[PDB]
Amino acid sequence: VSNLTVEAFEGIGSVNPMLFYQYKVTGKGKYDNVYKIIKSARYKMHSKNRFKPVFIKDDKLYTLEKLPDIEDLDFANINFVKSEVLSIEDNMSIYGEVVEYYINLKLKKVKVLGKYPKYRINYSKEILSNTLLTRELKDEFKKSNKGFNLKRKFRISPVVNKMGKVILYLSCSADFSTNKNIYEMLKEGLEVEGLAVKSEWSNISGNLVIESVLETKISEPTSLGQSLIDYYKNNNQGYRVKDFTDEDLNANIVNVRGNKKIYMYIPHALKPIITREYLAKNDPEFSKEIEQLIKMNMNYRYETLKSFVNDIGVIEELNNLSFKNKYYEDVKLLGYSSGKIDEPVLMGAKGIIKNKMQIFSNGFYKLPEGKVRFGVLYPKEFDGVSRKAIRAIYDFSKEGKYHGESNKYIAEHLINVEFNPKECIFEGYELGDITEYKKAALKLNNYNNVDFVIAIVPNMSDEEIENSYNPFKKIWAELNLPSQMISVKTAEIFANSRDNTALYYLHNIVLGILGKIGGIPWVVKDMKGDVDCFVGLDVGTREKGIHYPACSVVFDKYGKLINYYKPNIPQNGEKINTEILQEIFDKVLISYEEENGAYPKNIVIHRAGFSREDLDWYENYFGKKNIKFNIIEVKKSTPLKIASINEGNITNPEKGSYILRGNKAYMVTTDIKENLGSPKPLKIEKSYGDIDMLTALSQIYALTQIHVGATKSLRLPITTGYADKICKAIEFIPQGRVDNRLFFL
Amino acid sequence: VSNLTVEAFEGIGSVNPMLFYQYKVTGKGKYDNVYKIIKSARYKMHSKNRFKPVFIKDDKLYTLEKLPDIEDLDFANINFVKSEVLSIEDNMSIYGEVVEYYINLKLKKVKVLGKYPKYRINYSKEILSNTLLTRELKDEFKKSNKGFNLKRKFRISPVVNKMGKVILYLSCSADFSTNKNIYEMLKEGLEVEGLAVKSEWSNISGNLVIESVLETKISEPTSLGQSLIDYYKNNNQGYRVKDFTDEDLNANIVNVRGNKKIYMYIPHALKPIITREYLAKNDPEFSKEIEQLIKMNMNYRYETLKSFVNDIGVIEELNNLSFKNKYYEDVKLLGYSSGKIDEPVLMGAKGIIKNKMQIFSNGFYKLPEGKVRFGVLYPKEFDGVSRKAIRAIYDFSKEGKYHGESNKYIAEHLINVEFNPKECIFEGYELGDITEYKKAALKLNNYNNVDFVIAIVPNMSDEEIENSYNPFKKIWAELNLPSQMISVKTAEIFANSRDNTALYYLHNIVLGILGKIGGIPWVVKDMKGDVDCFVGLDVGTREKGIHYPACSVVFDKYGKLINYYKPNIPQNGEKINTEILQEIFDKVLISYEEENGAYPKNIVIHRAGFSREDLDWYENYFGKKNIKFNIIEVKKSTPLKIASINEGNITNPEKGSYILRGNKAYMVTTDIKENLGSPKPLKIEKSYGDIDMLTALSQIYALTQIHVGATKSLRLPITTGYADKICKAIEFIPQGRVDNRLFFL
């Protein structure tokens, strides 16, 4: 079989207990809180003493060599107290920061091509390398003609065991940067209006965009009364303007939007934000050619981290601590337990489907009762393309025909739709205003013979004349009319169809049309464990100060959506108030009581993120009702990657592969072939419950594969996944009584 | 006729341009922003120099006498720059702060009873007086046996004119305080668990409540490793524990909830929060006897401020500046323009109603089409009382009978209700859990013959076994069933009815029942101005970090509710995003187009609070559609009171009385007789429009008097008023298509 591993390198040899110099910090300012200044005190000590190692215990600053007591700082009076040898088993974190400091110090003295510094060391977790190991295993600078510099971005995190053995955890991202700021582009004369930029001089986190390029020079006094050069000279940064030339004073002032008022900045201060979109606007060949360099399968990540670990080498000051340059052959050496979860079985109209593609041959599982009449909006300039699009949709759905002819892939009468073009309507809408899109949706409500909408929207791209998806879905949510939107590009795929490329777009459109009219295309036959309903809690945050309301979804043990609950009030962050948990879980027990006749014996709560709520509330609320419950924290954003080993040959793992240690599990849900990247596994952890962790993993992986809006499964379980989809389609929630019509899908 | 005035005293004589000593502040810290430290620099200079006058211009600190340059502060290096005589017409605010400083300095040397300081001077706007002018015009300390001290709280705000004349604006609140902290109550042995307290030692704004009283002493070392006395000695406040006795070390530690973790505080630090509820729990005779002292009509406020101004007297250092002790006979001397708005006319089934009481004799204006069958929830222990309650409601509504007999007050068949107790239902619910209240509401949905609910809830008071209003209105909003709730006390008023006291409760219940089924009891015949629809915008904030979504209401020019729009996403504070204004005002124009066939020629926007949104967005959006628009900022919370003068005899003004200067108007909407307080007028101001301000005042006062859920009018116009009511009933918004059924009413 295939083993599973993590991006982990063993440390050859051990570190030893060695002498530190423990210091202390007191709050010299008007405050007295040393925890409010502890990290800033460490950083000012570190930078003010030629980058020498300083470490942080709760108030204690440890330091590897005897360094003088710094009273110079205005906020921290660092003073020597005692010198001691810290033991290993009490001080895992301090030895971890020791090892990562010495790895940073060892990597600072490694160069490529004899003159060029290979790494960019800040003595931290993250390590920017200036060169990249390419696909052909050669260290090479990835720069563009326009100077877009690609940089590999490493992330060490060594973990020291109590016996002194160290285990180097790694990852590698990519960094988009450039040596060319705005000033060389203005000397080149490039159009930089409306351009997203950042300042390397201020650490303010705020999205900066250029308004214009004022021909006013920087030596000329601005509307602030003085010039900008003297503005930075007065503000304790005259060293930045000291290295200027007389050519540099001819720089035109570029103004910038700063989300409250326009800031007046010199163009030397500002670097453009380097995204994928910016490369697509500037250097498309570079943006296409690094796509095999940033989306990295596990073999290429292993080769990148192998070159990294070989560039670390032996550290001569930790009892000759060196690292192995290969992964663990099995993660049972880490406490993790490998394994592959059994794939779900899915039921159709005929029985077991082998793919999600076969649901269109075998037939849908649960058609909604009745008959659903279409009604199509389309932009007026795309009438024949839209006609061919709806023709292909209706011939797929009702007549079972693809390219007009009856096909073996598609069974006849998949959904009970009636779209007679002699009877039914093609209301066309002019592209233009948003209020005209809303009135177009009202005019398609104005006739009573429309029960579902296949409205054609303009593209998500093409940032001119306004997109109609958002006004359409707003008005159809206000009127409780379900609707599957299609962009003009997919309508062009349907009208210009010659191969089977449009067929897959028709598969996912028909699954959307089915799920939005309350149909269910497949269900699982059984689900592992003693569960009666799933609850998927998630609290999202769109912007700063805006939190998505705590959208819950309620499933049965067979995965089909019982209910969703959206509280009308927003809340204070990722903590759900206990009145909101009262609303949510009363709605859970009410809906399971209605659809099943009794309370659930077991509830499994899939909280997306951290379940920071009162477990005392849960124990009270479900011990009052004799309900066993479980809380699982399913977490997406994790830099850990699970690689799969076939005798040293690193590869992506199959879906349903997990690693398991205690109450934390990392599980792969997506099958990604190489040259498409690497699967980002889910961080799954139990905050309370009686279930073993493998049962919650089987439930979560079965809840990924029963996503009913695509023919390929979701990365998330659809508890947290559909909670995220409701959080995205939160202004699209339909008005009428909450039911099994998955509007968001 | 009756004039109108404000709480304003003229300053006899003039102030003169006199020599200051202008200073400057630079940002000595790691920052450099002097605006971030300007007020703190003024306060540290003021307190560090025996409370000498310091003033604030943009960065300039002015100071009345030559004071030494203070380099002592760690954040501000105050240094003398120049000494000058500031002219009057440039420096209104600085002379205002001069005059209020010298008023504070003059009042600090005025005492009552020869030994007791009358005022508590912080040299600010607010001035706590220790004694109160009572109703019998005598200065007397209002203290309780339990030491609850009532204190009058003044608020000076003098405004200096360019010629040097000063006009003293005043107000007076009351202060609830006590000299008795927790320690004297614990020496008295009082139960202080669960009690809301504040600390006089820390300025942290956070609602503190006591968890328990730990018998652990303060000298004993706590779980923080040390004792609390040494905790305040280590934290630069050893002077507070220096004046203690050996008896004081026997104080038991009282812990306190601090909204993130329990703080460990000495009982000497903590003072109980003194509310009306706390007086009601402790000293009810004191809480009833000061009710004529805190709710103050305009005559008693005038006598209080008269005694205040006589206690100021002549200030010998401002060219003998003294104040008149009487109000302005007319506010045309202030630029304000007095006037009384014509009362609205209201239409019924027969025509002009003279009161809102006569709508039950003349008949409702617009009954909803169809027939509405009741259905009653009631608590199981109140069955006969509930039976008599619903009997009185139905005999008022359908049969037109009060106390079982046909009355001349009530016309027969007010609403088309059918409540046959042989046919219809009395579902009774056990008092208890919240989920049982929700299942009771579901079981009353479970039968189809219920079209409105008259559910009987337990009281808003009586903080034991749970109130059922919130689960009932949640489930009835989820099921789109309108419902008028009644507390057990009002059911007892109906069952124990002998006088006509229950009749008025029946008036407002039947108006609620009508407005919730989409009926309209009265409309105005015409409304002054060229208006076609009203838009009431309001963004409320319940807690810290939670903002109510920007609830809009759309009316016609005849006041009846066209529409309400609640955006599903919360936002960032009192700024409405332009996408939210797009949603809101497209919904406005859509709903007026649907109900009227065309766009409105004129829109009047009643924004509640500040209209801080882009007026460029409004001009773009309504110049694209050729819609004239107006924005009026209707503001509640205002310390200005409008008094009415009848030849020196100050009194409350009638409703519809306004004062008007430019684009700011204060208008009285509530008729309050004396001994019930004073009317709090509305601050009404136009941020943009073409209408004159008097037309917007007539529209706003007509929009107060057409409140259709009470027989006495609202203080707010029902644009901003119903926006506030939707913001309160925001988790009660019904599911189905938004219409004229005022669920919130």
Next chain:
DNA sequence: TGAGGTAGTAGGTTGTA
């Protein structure tokens, strides 16, 4: 917005106290 996944980039919130 066919759907889903990877990838960057930018910015958040919360515990750590």
Next chain:
DNA sequence: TACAACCTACTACCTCAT
């Protein structure tokens, strides 16, 4: 103030092939 560990928003590329 500050990082870690989670998030969200957005945009590219890329595939889909019983």
Next chain:
DNA sequence: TGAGGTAGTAGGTTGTA
């Protein structure tokens, strides 16, 4: 939560920059 108004108390947000 009959409805509405005054009154406190507590705490917010935003401009002032």
Next chain:
DNA sequence: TACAACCTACTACCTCAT
């Protein structure tokens, strides 16, 4: 950090009287 000018939340008293 800080006030001004607006807000919200909560609780008392108080009236309602064609």
